[PDB]
Amino acid sequence: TQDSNYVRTLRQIELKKLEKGAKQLMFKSSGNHTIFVDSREKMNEFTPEKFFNTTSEMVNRSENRLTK
Amino acid sequence: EMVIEGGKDRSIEGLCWSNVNGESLRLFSIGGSTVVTEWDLATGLPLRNYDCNSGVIWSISINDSQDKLSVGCDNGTVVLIDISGGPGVLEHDTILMRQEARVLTLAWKKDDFVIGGCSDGRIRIWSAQKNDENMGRLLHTMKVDKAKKESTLVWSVIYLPRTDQIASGDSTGSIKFWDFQFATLNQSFKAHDADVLCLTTDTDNNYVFSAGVDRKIFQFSQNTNKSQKNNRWVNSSNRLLHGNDIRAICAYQSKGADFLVSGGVEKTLVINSLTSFSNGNYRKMPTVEPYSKNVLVNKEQRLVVSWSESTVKIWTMGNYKLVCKLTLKDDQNISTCSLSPDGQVLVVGRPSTTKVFHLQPVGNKLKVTKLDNDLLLRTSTKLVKFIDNSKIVICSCEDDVFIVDQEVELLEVTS
Amino acid sequence: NPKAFPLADAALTQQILDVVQQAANLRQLKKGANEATKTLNRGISEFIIMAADCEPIEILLHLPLLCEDKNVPYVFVPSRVALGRACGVSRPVIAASITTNDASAIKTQIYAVKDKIETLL
Amino acid sequence: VVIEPHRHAGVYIARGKEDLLVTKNMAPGESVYGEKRISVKVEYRVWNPFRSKLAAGIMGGLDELFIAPGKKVLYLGAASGTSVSHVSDVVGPEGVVYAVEFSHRPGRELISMAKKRPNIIPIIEDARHPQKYRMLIGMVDCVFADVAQPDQARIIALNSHMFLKDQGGVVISIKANCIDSTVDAETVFAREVQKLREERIKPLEQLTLEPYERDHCIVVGRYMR
Amino acid sequence: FKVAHLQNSQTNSVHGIVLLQGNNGWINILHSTSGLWLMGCKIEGVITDFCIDYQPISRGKFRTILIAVNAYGEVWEFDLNKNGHVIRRWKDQGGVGITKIQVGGGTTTTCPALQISKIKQNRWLAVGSESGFVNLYDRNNAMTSSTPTPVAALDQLTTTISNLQFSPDGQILCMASR
Amino acid sequence: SLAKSPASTIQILGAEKALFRALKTKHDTPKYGLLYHASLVGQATGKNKGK
Amino acid sequence: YVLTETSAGYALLKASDKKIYKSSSLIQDLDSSDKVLKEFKIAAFSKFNSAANALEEANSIIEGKVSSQLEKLLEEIKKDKKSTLIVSETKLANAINKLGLNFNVVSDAVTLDIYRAIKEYLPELLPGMSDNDLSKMSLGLAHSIGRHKLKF
Amino acid sequence: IKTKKRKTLKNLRKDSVKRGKFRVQLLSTTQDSKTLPPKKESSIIRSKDRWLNRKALNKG
Amino acid sequence: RYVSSMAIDNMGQQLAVGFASGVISIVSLADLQIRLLKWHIDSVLSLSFSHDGSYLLSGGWEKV
């Protein structure tokens, strides 16, 4: 029972290190973004920088896009 | 009197009336979807599509005193909908205590309890009595005699108020009567050969009629004084009247009317007598009585147009030859139609829009072209009847009488 | 008791106490409120069963408060005496935590009962 | 060590040793719930996309988040300060958040953080009766919903028809299990955006915030009239 | 099965019934000479055991009650001298795996009455369980409560109760485990 | 935060350095903690003050 | 030719309309106000404006969270009794003080629109108060009613 | 034209195409949503009629 | 409508009319409500009740 106590407190150390290490990281989002539009031409077009505003740097990663 | 049509891929599985004394009739209906649909009887349209907040609705029932509405859903929920707010306005009230299997049929005891037969072979009893301690939680569960080689589904549940029982038909064909207090079986009959889809009772609960996919209607009677003082139903009688199935059964009983009405997979209706079921006579209605027509002919070109759901077809006499058809699928629902004398322009018209098509006989075929008119494209039409080769008169679903190609003064009626 | 949220009906409480009896035979439950909270802290509990029968219920209704932090299912059954019979000791048991396992024989029964629990949340 | 701004002022990205999202302070000096505090002379509280729900929508990318530093916002579902603290940080001391909840067990810490911030005013009444707090405030510029009740669309429809000015924002977080389990998130979210555009809410975007929450979505819309 | 006595209750004619415990909740009662199925009583759950109680009514008339227990602990009492209809439904306090119910102190099926006027009402009712716990109810007062409390819960032997029998006077109960 | 802690923690609540050194090497943990100065534990004498 | 009962604390306000009662309870679509349409349609008739007294504030708060037949509403029935005029109540559950004595009350489906207008522009013309003052008195009332219901 | 008429019909009728990481859904019309109740869930309708036409009841 | 058998029970509450078509009909003598029992595919030749009246023996042209 005391070496089970030893392994259990080692496990709890790593558990707390895990949770308050993952609390201070940032993970890349992966969500199905959906945009609702009007009749058919707004859907046929490219969504023309409606929130990208550059098609090179600030389009395809969404953790912070920008408006210059 | 009236017909309220629905369109492509629309069905209707349950429907219940509601008439609080002094107010208009109200008609709710579930389809195969997540909403309840309340219809206003004037126009023949939905006036409310209340999306019930849990899953696909399998059954609907109306409270006694008709202020609440149970919808029993596919994810095992029983949702209460507050009805008494006036015609049209429906509120969510309470989701009752959940379960695993889908609740396939509902009934109410009174304003107090709600009984539900589910697809795991069981019959739950919830309490919908507001301001009790056990409101919404399921008080009892009963289990019917399962089939040996397939799953059992309890398909029909009614409450019998003269005694204190629940009658229940399930998919083994067995019909069971359960004492409500003590929540337990009194007697089971092995009546049908396959499922019992629908069962009903009369006013004083001297009879219980029942029917299902084996297409016989069974009658269980308790009319003897010894039957009433011993609480013992007998399997009285049995009739074979339907051709394929019976999916719906109901009963009406008044001073000059006592008939049970039944219909099924074969499309016809059947009327029998309630207190004289086995003895008396019955009437199998015609499968269609065309109070609203789907066919009309024009004498020029010897031709006839006919519209089923969302397609029209035209053929000529000669033999006969199908000259043209219009499977307009921008449409979803059809209604009435008329052709011009000389056979030039067809006009099809439903309660949401109408559309007019020029026709030209190109020989052994026709050529049909839409002619645009946005007044027609915006108006609701019931009847179009062609004053001239160009002038038609339009009766709108909101009681307007136009004359196009404009307004008839129409006096009011005493309400 | 009013403040014992989700309480099980008879069929669900019968299968809850059946899986409690076979977990007690497989030595896969921690019986008692302090052992239940220890498994809640360590994150090795599948679901928590409590008894809506203790005369202070506030000696119980604190492990809900850290069940809803670790989104572990919890349920109430009406009898501490019957929970103690199911756990297989001679005393009444107020709370019991079914511990986690991945080679367990009754893993499917545990998963079925915990899904029936989280339907009523 | 380098703080860059976001699309919405009051929301920043602290890049450097940990490129992680962050808001300002309206609480001078202290954290509220042990969130990490970064100073760059000026104090900053880290938002978490897992501990909170709006931060997950920001991390998934919400362009016209109507929570914005020149408004006042109505928060129907926090139960505790762990999100409305960051909403008061982003709305600043110019405006006001109305954090309205029902279950008074974590309303204690709700009122406790509303003591520290005058930005946050609490309401301890259920959000299906907005008439019981008619007499407290009206005409908000953006509602937020985090209720996990089945009548989400009806609750926020009543709150937006009573307290939301025209052309304002609606942000609703929808849990799929609180409406309908056993059917997938795509059908239940399409059903809820149709249920919400039954009211005068033009839907703008939905996103599913999948690395932070299982089977959730955030739907934004503009209140028509 | 268990064998018991039943009265016609329009004649004063008794006949033996055998009572078979079936699958769902069913007890099938049938005649002990002709084998005709007389009635059936269904309880809700897993039927585990049942017992027969008798109570006298007048000179030469008695009434037969079937007492059947769920596995979970809820007990049905069926009056079966009329049609097999429930008269009482109560719940065992504690008890989760219920294996054996027995009555005693009067005429049981194991202390049977030789003469119809010697039929007695049973005083005690013991519900013995899978953990070895035997609740003991005193039916001189525990026929009214509908959540009756036991007069004692015995716990002396620790594995599954498979026999529990009352002595004919009703002063000893015999717990036994196989 | 004290109420949602198990009773074993409330036992050893004061003696954290002795506890965690006696766990991080495999030794015997304390039994009194901050609760040693209660009057009942004062009334007890022997190993039953641990009890 | 009508009044409307609007609250902000213990301070109640029976604000009269700049049009007829039928015009108030019939159209409601002509305001659409930026500020001038609500400023023209508004008329600060009666303001039973109490103070930051916790007793009066929590009393009207309980009467707002319940039926609205408080003493301030009796004061409004006193200070609007001209020819049994028409009133616009906020909540339909205040039916007692809505129709108790000589007041034709109406609160349905456009009363909410005119309450949206007058609640949008309470502070700009109805009192002699400012926006931070209205938010401070609202949060004082809010903390009072919160610590009253939620005990401590 | 015979082997792709249903293809061009469905590819012109259907909506909600992809745009990279995104998906541009059409919102529906108050016309259809107020003229008709929504369609049946073919899963549950097929479940009910497939049950009533299971093989164990010998239909004919 | 030809009747080839009839039987009564020991109380006179019910009565079995067996017809030559094959059916049996239990009438309840206090109120003259009938119940049909159809198994015999040829004529019903013999009927009897049990003593309590809850079982009806029948026999006909099948040797069953």
UniProtKB/Swiss-Prot annotation, chain A:
Belongs to the UTP11 family. It comes from Saccharomyces cerevisiae (strain ATCC 204508 / S288c) (Baker's yeast). It is found in: Nucleus, Nucleolus. This is U3 small nucleolar RNA-associated protein 11. Transmembrane segments: none annotated. Its main location: nucleus. The keyword Cell membrane does not apply. Keywords: Nucleus, Ribonucleoprotein, Ribosome biogenesis, rRNA processing.
From Swiss-Prot, chain B:
The keyword Transcription applies. Keywords: Nucleus, Repeat, Ribonucleoprotein, Ribosome biogenesis, rRNA processing, Transcription, WD repeat. Its main location: nucleus. One of its GO terms (cellular component) is nucleoplasm. WD repeats lie at residues 45-82, 91-127, 143-179, 184-221, 323-358. Coiled coil: none annotated. The keyword Transcription applies. Disulfide bonds: none annotated. GO terms for biological process: maturation of SSU-rRNA; maturation of SSU-rRNA from tricistronic rRNA transcript (SSU-rRNA, 5.8S rRNA, LSU-rRNA); positive regulation of transcription by RNA polymerase I. It is found in: Nucleus, Nucleolus. Present with 5440 molecules/cell in log phase SD medium. Involved in nucleolar processing of pre-18S ribosomal RNA. Required for optimal pre-ribosomal RNA transcription by RNA polymerase I together with a subset of U3 proteins required for transcription (t-UTPs). Interacts with snoRNA U3. Interacts with MPP10. Component of the ribosomal small subunit (SSU) processome composed of at least 40 protein subunits and snoRNA U3. In the absence of snoRNA3, forms a complex with other t-UTPs. This complex can associate with pre-18S ribosomal RNAs. This is U3 small nucleolar RNA-associated protein 4. It comes from Saccharomyces cerevisiae (strain ATCC 204508 / S288c) (Baker's yeast). The lineage of its organism: Eukaryota, Fungi, Dikarya, Ascomycota, Saccharomycotina. The gene is UTP4.
From Swiss-Prot, chain E:
It comes from the Eukaryota. Transmembrane segments: none annotated. It is found in: Nucleus, Nucleolus. WD repeats lie at residues 106-147. Interacts with snoRNA U3. Interacts with MPP10, UTP21 and UTP25. Component of the ribosomal small subunit (SSU) processome composed of at least 40 protein subunits and snoRNA U3. Present with 9570 molecules/cell in log phase SD medium. Belongs to the WD repeat UTP18 family. This is U3 small nucleolar RNA-associated protein 18. It comes from Saccharomyces cerevisiae (strain ATCC 204508 / S288c) (Baker's yeast). The lineage of its organism: Eukaryota, Fungi, Dikarya, Ascomycota, Saccharomycotina. The gene is UTP18. The chain holds residues 358 to 535 of 594 of the full protein.
Swiss-Prot record, chain F:
It is found in: Nucleus, Nucleolus. Belongs to the NOP5/NOP56 family. Interacts with SIK1/NOP56 and NOP1. Interacts with the trimethylguanosine synthase TGS1. Component of the ribosomal small subunit (SSU) processome composed of at least 40 protein subunits and snoRNA U3. Present with 34700 molecules/cell in log phase SD medium. Required for pre-18S rRNA processing. May bind microtubules. This is Nucleolar protein 58. It comes from Saccharomyces cerevisiae (strain ATCC 204508 / S288c) (Baker's yeast).
